[PDB]
Design an enzyme around this catalytic site. Sequence first.
Site, PDB file in Angstrom:
ATOM      1  N   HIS A  40       0.777  -1.244   0.055  1.00 55.65           N
ATOM      2  CA  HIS A  40      -0.139  -0.039   0.054  1.00 55.65           C
ATOM      3  C   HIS A  40       0.799   1.272  -0.031  1.00 55.65           C
ATOM      4  O   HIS A  40       0.178   2.258  -0.249  1.00 55.65           O
ATOM      5  CB  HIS A  40      -1.177  -0.083   1.043  1.00 55.65           C
ATOM      6  CG  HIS A  40      -0.751   0.488   2.407  1.00 55.65           C
ATOM      7  ND1 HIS A  40      -0.682  -0.293   3.395  1.00 55.65           N
ATOM      8  CD2 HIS A  40      -0.453   1.588   2.718  1.00 55.65           C
ATOM      9  CE1 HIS A  40      -0.194   0.215   4.620  1.00 55.65           C
ATOM     10  NE2 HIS A  40      -0.338   1.703   4.063  1.00 55.65           N
ATOM     11  N   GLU A  52      18.836   7.077   8.730  1.00 59.67           N
ATOM     12  CA  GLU A  52      18.084   8.501   9.301  1.00 59.67           C
ATOM     13  C   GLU A  52      17.783   8.337  10.809  1.00 59.67           C
ATOM     14  O   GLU A  52      17.502   7.172  11.212  1.00 59.67           O
ATOM     15  CB  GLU A  52      16.865   8.618   8.380  1.00 59.67           C
ATOM     16  CG  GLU A  52      16.974   9.110   7.044  1.00 59.67           C
ATOM     17  CD  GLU A  52      17.259  10.506   6.992  1.00 59.67           C
ATOM     18  OE1 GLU A  52      17.667  10.999   8.106  1.00 59.67           O
ATOM     19  OE2 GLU A  52      17.074  10.999   5.871  1.00 59.67           O
ATOM     20  N   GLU A  62      23.579   9.303   7.011  1.00 64.69           N
ATOM     21  CA  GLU A  62      22.573   9.021   6.060  1.00 64.69           C
ATOM     22  C   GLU A  62      23.165   8.471   4.571  1.00 64.69           C
ATOM     23  O   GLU A  62      24.163   8.952   4.127  1.00 64.69           O
ATOM     24  CB  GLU A  62      21.726  10.085   5.553  1.00 64.69           C
ATOM     25  CG  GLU A  62      20.866  11.019   6.524  1.00 64.69           C
ATOM     26  CD  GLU A  62      21.516  12.115   7.188  1.00 64.69           C
ATOM     27  OE1 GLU A  62      22.990  12.197   7.086  1.00 64.69           O
ATOM     28  OE2 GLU A  62      20.718  12.771   7.933  1.00 64.69           O
ATOM     29  N   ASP A  84       0.166  -7.685   1.930  1.00 62.87           N
ATOM     30  CA  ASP A  84       0.460  -6.009   2.117  1.00 62.87           C
ATOM     31  C   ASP A  84       2.049  -5.991   2.227  1.00 62.87           C
ATOM     32  O   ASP A  84       2.598  -5.737   2.988  1.00 62.87           O
ATOM     33  CB  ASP A  84       0.025  -5.403   2.975  1.00 62.87           C
ATOM     34  CG  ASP A  84      -0.047  -3.764   2.834  1.00 62.87           C
ATOM     35  OD1 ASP A  84       0.497  -3.477   1.625  1.00 62.87           O
ATOM     36  OD2 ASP A  84      -0.391  -3.017   3.734  1.00 62.87           O
ATOM     37  N   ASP A 171       0.326   2.042  19.732  1.00 62.38           N
ATOM     38  CA  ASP A 171      -0.006   1.452  18.611  1.00 62.38           C
ATOM     39  C   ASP A 171       1.236   1.927  17.522  1.00 62.38           C
ATOM     40  O   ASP A 171       1.807   2.988  17.866  1.00 62.38           O
ATOM     41  CB  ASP A 171      -0.990   1.506  18.057  1.00 62.38           C
ATOM     42  CG  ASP A 171      -1.838   0.821  17.017  1.00 62.38           C
ATOM     43  OD1 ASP A 171      -1.140  -0.311  16.539  1.00 62.38           O
ATOM     44  OD2 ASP A 171      -3.049   1.039  16.516  1.00 62.38           O
ATOM     45  N   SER A 172       1.238   1.514  16.228  1.00 58.62           N
ATOM     46  CA  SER A 172       1.532   2.231  15.208  1.00 58.62           C
ATOM     47  C   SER A 172       0.577   3.048  14.515  1.00 58.62           C
ATOM     48  O   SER A 172      -0.622   2.781  14.967  1.00 58.62           O
ATOM     49  CB  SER A 172       2.426   1.134  14.294  1.00 58.62           C
ATOM     50  OG  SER A 172       1.459   0.476  13.781  1.00 58.62           O
ATOM     51  N   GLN A 174      -0.708   6.077  10.912  1.00 57.06           N
ATOM     52  CA  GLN A 174      -0.301   6.663   9.728  1.00 57.06           C
ATOM     53  C   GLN A 174       1.245   7.089   9.769  1.00 57.06           C
ATOM     54  O   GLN A 174       1.657   7.801  10.519  1.00 57.06           O
ATOM     55  CB  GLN A 174      -1.283   7.909   9.477  1.00 57.06           C
ATOM     56  CG  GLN A 174      -2.674   7.532   9.080  1.00 57.06           C
ATOM     57  CD  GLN A 174      -3.725   6.601  10.170  1.00 57.06           C
ATOM     58  OE1 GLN A 174      -3.788   7.098  11.275  1.00 57.06           O
ATOM     59  NE2 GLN A 174      -4.104   5.423   9.616  1.00 57.06           N
ATOM     60  N   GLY A 175       1.621   6.702   8.701  1.00 62.29           N
ATOM     61  CA  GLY A 175       3.252   7.228   8.382  1.00 62.29           C
ATOM     62  C   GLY A 175       4.339   6.313   8.925  1.00 62.29           C
ATOM     63  O   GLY A 175       5.501   6.133   8.334  1.00 62.29           O
ATOM     64  N   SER A 177       3.572   2.753   8.248  1.00 65.41           N
ATOM     65  CA  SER A 177       3.267   1.968   7.143  1.00 65.41           C
ATOM     66  C   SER A 177       4.454   1.470   6.431  1.00 65.41           C
ATOM     67  O   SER A 177       5.108   2.306   6.232  1.00 65.41           O
ATOM     68  CB  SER A 177       2.046   2.258   6.192  1.00 65.41           C
ATOM     69  OG  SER A 177       0.862   2.477   6.992  1.00 65.41           O
ATOM     70  N   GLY A 178       4.636   0.076   6.359  1.00 64.25           N
ATOM     71  CA  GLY A 178       5.642  -0.400   5.577  1.00 64.25           C
ATOM     72  C   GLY A 178       6.883  -0.578   6.475  1.00 64.25           C
ATOM     73  O   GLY A 178       7.714  -1.430   5.834  1.00 64.25           O
TER      74      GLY A 178
END
Length: 223
Positions: A40, A52, A62, A84, A171-172, A174-175, A177-178
């Site tokens: 997604h 980072e 970096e 996913d 929790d985890s 938005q942002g 993700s992945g």
Amino acid sequence: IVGGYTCGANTVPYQVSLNSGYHFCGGSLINSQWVVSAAHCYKSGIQVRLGEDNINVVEGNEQFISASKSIVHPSYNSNTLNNDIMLIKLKSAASLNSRVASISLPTSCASAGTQCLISGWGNTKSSGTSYPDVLKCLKAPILSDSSCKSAYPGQITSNMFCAGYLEGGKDSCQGDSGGPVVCSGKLQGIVSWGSGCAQKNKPGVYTKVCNYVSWIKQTIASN
Ligand SMILES: [Ca+2]
């Protein structure tokens, strides 16, 4: 990450930021040239940012490397978020060091009760919006399949597991993700989805990476 803690700079050396002008998703470095993320999170024009901490300041560790190819799982379904997962190949190999390091793939799946480390630059509020500049971390347990399915009737597939706290607050989000879920040194999950963030009875849902190790290995071997 809601209800976590500041990880510390470069303490999660496999954590990557996916950048398309701005951070938009996490990922995990799995060897010098490949990153695993959520399907997604797909888009074109990805730059992978390794090493980072503060995603808004150049701090000196970096490595910024363009994606040469993205591969979304053959069976990804964006409506159900089943499968996913996606692989990103880097245009050049990362220089691996103490602060930029690959995370081991699992040889066996993880079980309910195991503690894991979940990390990312996502939202830190559950009824609010505040995006951190430095990497945040959360220690959380894997939940039972039955409590996972009970929290999310009709939505949990064999390629998903829940982790976190049914009481809410941690929790985890938005942002995130992945990004990684790492248990005893192995990449067991990918931040995938959840109803809101850190809501009671709505734990995080994660891609079950151990299901995909054969796909990952054969894909890497031919690409
Ligand atoms: Ca930086």
